[PDB]
């Protein structure tokens, strides 16, 4: 696999950068439990995604929302996300995603879990922005999702 491996150079055009940080912060700011609520949706649409987290597999949304493991996974998504959104520096991505990638591959979380995540956050963004989710917003975000997508999973040993 791993065509072109790691390179990336100057990733997104500045206008895409301006709009992906602004919107991530709009959402983070205005919707307090945003990231957990994204996970609580993924599990509705894809019940096996619940199963990759063995212990909580089989719980209802209300006792899903108060799980030490759910909350801790969610703020960890939250911090990797805010770390990148700070500068959208394409190549501090390699060390950021490095352990994530290994533990995800160990619990068999892959490509259709990342895809799903992207769909559900895309949705959240649109519920937030309204009619002013005018397509630069969608493109910049997909491009961001591609930069990130490009260098994910396994070389786990
Ligand atoms: C952009 C999305 C995501 C990010 C950045 C992310 C990040 C992380 C992080 C920080 C870890 C732990 C790494 C460590 O211990 O050093 C982790 C673990 C885990 N995550 Fe994710 N996650 C994401 C998406 C998902 C999705 C969508 C699933 C499953 C449908 C998932 C399932 C798990 C599982 C099962 C663990 C368990 C603990 C472990 O073995 O480390 N994650 N994730």
Swiss-Prot record:
Keywords: Acetylation, Heme, Iron, Metal-binding, Oxygen transport, Transport. The keyword Heme applies. Heme b binds at residues 73, 104. One of its GO terms (cellular component) is hemoglobin complex. InterPro entries: Erythrocruorin (IPR002336), Globin (IPR000971), Globin-like_sf (IPR009050), Globin/Proto (IPR012292), Mb-like_M (IPR044399). Disulfide bonds: none annotated. The modification N-acetylglycine is found at residue 1. GO terms for molecular function: heme binding; metal ion binding; oxygen binding; oxygen carrier activity. Residues 11-157 form the Globin domain. PROSITE patterns: GLOBIN. Belongs to the globin family. Monomer. PANTHER family: GLOBIN-LIKE PROTEIN. Caudina arenicola coelomocytes contain four hemoglobin chains labeled A, B, C, D. This is Globin C, coelomic.
């Amino acid at each position: 696999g791993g065509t072109l491996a790691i390179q990336a150079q100057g990733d997104l055009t500045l206008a895409q950068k301006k709009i992906v940080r602004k919107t991530w912060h709009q959402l983070m700011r205005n919707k307090t439990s945003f990231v957990t609520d994204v996970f609580i949706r993924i599990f509705a649409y894809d019940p096996s995604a619940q199963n990759k987290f063995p212990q909580m597999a089989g719980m209802s949304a209300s006792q899903l929302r108060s799980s030490r493991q759910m909350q801790a996974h969610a703020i960890r998504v939250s911090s990797i996300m805010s770390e990148y959104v700070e500068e959208l520096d394409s190549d501090i991505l390699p060390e950021l995603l490095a352990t994530l990638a290994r533990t995800h591959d160990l619990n068999k979380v892959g490509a259709d879990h990342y895809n799903l995540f992207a769909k559900v956050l895309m949705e959240a963004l649109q519920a937030e922005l309204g009619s002013d989710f005018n397509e630069k917003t969608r493109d910049a975000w997909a491009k961001a999702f591609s930069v990130v997508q490009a260098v994910l999973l396994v070389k786990h040993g």
